[PDB]
Amino acid sequence: SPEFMARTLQGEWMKVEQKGGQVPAPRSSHGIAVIGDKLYCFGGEDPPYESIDNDLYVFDFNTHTWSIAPANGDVPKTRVLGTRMVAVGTKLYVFGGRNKQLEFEDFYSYDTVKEEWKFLTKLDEKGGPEARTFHSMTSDENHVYVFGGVSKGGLNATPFRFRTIEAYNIAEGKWAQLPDPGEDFEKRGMAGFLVVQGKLWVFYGFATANDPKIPTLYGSQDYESNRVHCYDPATQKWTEVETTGFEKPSRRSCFAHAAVGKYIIIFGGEIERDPEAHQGPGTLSREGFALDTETLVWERYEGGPIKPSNRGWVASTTTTINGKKGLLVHGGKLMTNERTDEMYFFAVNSST
Amino acid sequence: SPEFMARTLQGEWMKVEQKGGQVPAPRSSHGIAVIGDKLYCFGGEDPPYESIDNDLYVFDFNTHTWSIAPANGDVPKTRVLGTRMVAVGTKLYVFGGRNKQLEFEDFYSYDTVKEEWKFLTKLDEKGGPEARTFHSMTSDENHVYVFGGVSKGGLNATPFRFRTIEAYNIAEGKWAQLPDPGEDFEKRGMAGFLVVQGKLWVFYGFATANDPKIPTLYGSQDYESNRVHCYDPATQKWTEVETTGFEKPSRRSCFAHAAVGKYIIIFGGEIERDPEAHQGPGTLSREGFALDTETLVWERYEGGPIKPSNRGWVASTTTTINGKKGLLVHGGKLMTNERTDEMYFFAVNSST
Ligand code: NA
Ligand code: NA
């Protein structure tokens, strides 16, 4: 064991070459997911507060080219920002997001084999999953999960944030809300949300305050979280997790995140609020951190000469490229306040 | 007492109008100080790693115009970056900084009445104050104080950081090193350093690691500090100060800072390292924080519609403008990596 400590999580940052095709306009606040060797991309924001399109873009990692998936079936009726998309088996699932006119996307699947959309659930109905934007999503073998986000405004309410998870059982075609973690747990948008070794992790994100003593900043108490909780479906219990380390990341939201084995791997994110909400970029991070969910220790990671610049509001997912599992980062906004079309992959080398 | 908490330190950010005159080129890593209604400016960096000039620029707050002070006497022989300047009585004191060729500025005064420079001390001599760059400075009635910074490289050493304070007794014309705070105290450059209600405060800054277990980032263990110490000249004792608050600022260096009554007031700063040291801007903050040195509580402050953008490596000082004490911020680098000529003043309204 050398005197000087080398970093534990080792890997390489790579910029993914995009050769061409029907390439998506730059975007933030969108959803991506991978099935096999293909990345799917839906939704997005650019310019600020404006949605863009409702095409389903497909990037092939072997050919490094983009195409547009056939727009068959129940094509999603709204072009949205603040949306998310996950993959389970050969289907993609899109939930929520909204446009500037406050119309929210309902719940749809896309069958990548038959190449068709299916409308699955109308949101915001009595006893069903609510309309949400800037929520987070993850999935496992038989569920799509939605955490947090911001609600739809109505006559007698302004939008608020959620602290709940809605779970869609794919085989049964049924939604259920998971146990509510209660008042000590922050309602948040753009939080980290992942299945890791069978359990659900909710971490960091952009929180509603539950304390009138927290002073406002730019007229709102809203702040960046650094808290971490775990839900075990096997027992249906919530626990708050104390995480440690000299390099524990400062409070942040809107970051790339993925699970690789025991690691939660993040990159970028909003570390300071913009004075004008989402109009400007606030302050965005250029750093990557990983949490060992077994030891509960955070450490930064580095990936060689390729260093992605400051960014947040990216789409992210886990995939495997050239036999390496890792964190895929696509799009987002930069400190120039421009959207980017850049795609980066942190390829993990060490054991997980 | 209302249910919802208003901010304690209240004030107004103002952009100081600069009408014209012999206006200084944009710069970071320079020194400013005020005597009466005049701001003095010396040194600076632009482009990265390059010094600029050795003029003493003078801004009159009543006329809002710049001039160049007569270059009489022992004009400082080197154009430097990483320099600092303080005012005591009607004299300015310039210490250190270096140029790209690793020549360091010695210790000079400028007499604002007689309008002449005097060479006071050759640095880096046996038993005397060392050559330093990226040190911090403050002063009181009869002393100029230098804290931290980076040393001059020689044959058998690379530059290192200091954890000591050198104190120049103006009346006696003599330097002395203050008690060394020891190994648990971080050697730092670009740290906060102020006299507050008679005591010396050292806070945050850019630290050398004293633990081979801290992993390197971009090839160096160097990291941003969040520690706070106080030295009382009356007893000659050091104490580490535990500061608190939900809005305690994340680790940072290279920030604007000033003392107003019981408050240490800061703005901006490097919150993430650049991959290439000082070549790029790293990640810079757009937030202001204040520490009540009596209660030891940190809180953010806000100043109305004028919100200075992300910046660090600014020059800063305390002054009074239109009967309001506050924090003066001049120059620095922006997240575009450009230097700025902008000048901002946070005018304090509440009791201190
Ligand atoms: Na394939
Ligand atoms: Na005057």
Side-chain angles (χ1 to χ4, degrees), chain A residues 7-18 20-125 127-173 175-182 184-212 214-241 243-282:
Chain A
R7 292 184 176 287
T8 299
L9 181 66
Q10 277 180 67
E12 183 184 357
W13 274 114
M14 313 189 312
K15 188 167 181 178
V16 182
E17 190 193 8
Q18 304 178 57
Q22 292 72 57
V23 187
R27 57 196 64 214
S28 71
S29 316
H30 58 303
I32 69 176
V34 174
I35 295 168
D37 290 329
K38 298 188 181 56
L39 177 74
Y40 297 84
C41 175
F42 181 84
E45 184 180 16
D46 191 30
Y49 295 106
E50 303 279 351
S51 60
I52 304 173
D53 54 34
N54 71 347
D55 308 272
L56 182 60
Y57 297 91
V58 188
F59 184 75
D60 186 305
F61 285 110
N62 299 123
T63 66
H64 291 90
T65 59
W66 287 96
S67 65
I68 291 173
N72 299 321
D74 301 321
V75 176
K77 55 198 173 294
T78 306
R79 300 171 176 186
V80 293
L81 54 80
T83 192
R84 296 284 316 272
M85 182 169 63
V86 299
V88 182
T90 52
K91 292 185 176 58
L92 299 159
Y93 297 85
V94 169
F95 184 110
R98 65 162 176 73
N99 63 17
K100 190 179 178 57
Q101 294 70 38
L102 309 186
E103 296 156 9
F104 283 67
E105 202 81 86
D106 291 307
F107 186 56
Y108 294 80
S109 63
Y110 190 85
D111 182 339
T112 62
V113 173
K114 305 298 178 164
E115 291 180 315
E116 61 189 6
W117 288 104
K118 183 172 181 189
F119 171 78
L120 293 177
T121 319
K122 182 65 210 174
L123 301 184
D124 236 36
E125 299 282 303
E130 318 88 340
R132 313 194 180 189
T133 181
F134 293 118
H135 55 293
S136 299
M137 291 182 80
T138 187
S139 64
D140 60 22
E141 300 96 329
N142 188 41
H143 299 86
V144 173
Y145 300 107
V146 171
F147 167 75
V150 178
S151 70
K152 180 197 294 189
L155 179 56
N156 292 328
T158 45
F160 53 83
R161 296 191 182 84
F162 295 96
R163 62 175 183 237
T164 51
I165 298 170
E166 282 285 333
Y168 180 71
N169 183 310
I170 291 159
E172 294 177 336
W175 286 97
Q177 188 191 278
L178 300 185
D180 187 331
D184 292 326
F185 177 112
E186 297 159 315
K187 303 166 184 73
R188 284 166 281 178
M190 299 303 288
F193 186 40
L194 297 169
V195 175
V196 185
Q197 297 185 324
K199 293 197 263 288
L200 282 55
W201 290 71
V202 178
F203 52 104
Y204 285 50
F206 196 68
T208 298
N210 184 26
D211 187 355
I214 290 174
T216 60
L217 178 67
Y218 312 133
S220 177
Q221 301 182 281
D222 295 351
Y223 64 87
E224 313 288 348
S225 173
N226 62 0
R227 288 174 64 204
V228 183
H229 288 77
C230 180
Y231 174 79
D232 188 353
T235 65
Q236 309 179 303
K237 299 175 183 295
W238 280 100
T239 58
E240 179 157 8
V241 180
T243 58
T244 65
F246 183 69
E247 296 186 317
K248 179 163 173 173
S250 62
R251 299 163 170 285
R252 65 192 60 208
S253 64
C254 310
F255 47 81
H257 57 283
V260 185
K262 68 188 162 184
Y263 292 101
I264 286 172
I265 304 177
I266 78 178
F267 183 79
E270 179 182 89
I271 52 178
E272 303 179 331
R273 286 179 51 200
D274 196 74
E276 295 166 338
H278 305 173
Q279 186 65 42

Side-chain angles (χ1 to χ4, degrees), chain B residues 147-165:
Chain B
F147 167 75
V150 178
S151 70
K152 180 197 294 189
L155 179 56
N156 292 328
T158 45
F160 53 83
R161 296 191 182 84
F162 295 96
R163 62 175 183 237
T164 51
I165 298 170

Side-chain angles (χ1 to χ4, degrees), chain A residues 3-5 7 212 215-218 223 246 251 271-272 275 283-287 302 307 310, chain B residues 3-5 7 212 215-218 223 246 251 271-272 275 283-287 302 307 310:
Chain A
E3 178 178 14
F4 284 80
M5 175 82 72
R7 292 184 176 287
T216 60
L217 178 67
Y218 312 133
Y223 64 87
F246 183 69
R251 299 163 170 285
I271 52 178
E272 303 179 331
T283 309
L284 303 167
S285 176
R286 57 184 304 122
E287 294 188 353
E302 303 185 79
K307 299 165 165 69
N310 306 67
Chain B
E3 178 178 14
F4 284 80
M5 175 82 72
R7 292 184 176 287
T216 60
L217 178 67
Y218 312 133
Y223 64 87
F246 183 69
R251 299 163 170 285
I271 52 178
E272 303 179 331
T283 309
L284 303 167
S285 176
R286 57 184 304 122
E287 294 188 353
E302 303 185 79
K307 299 165 165 69
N310 306 67

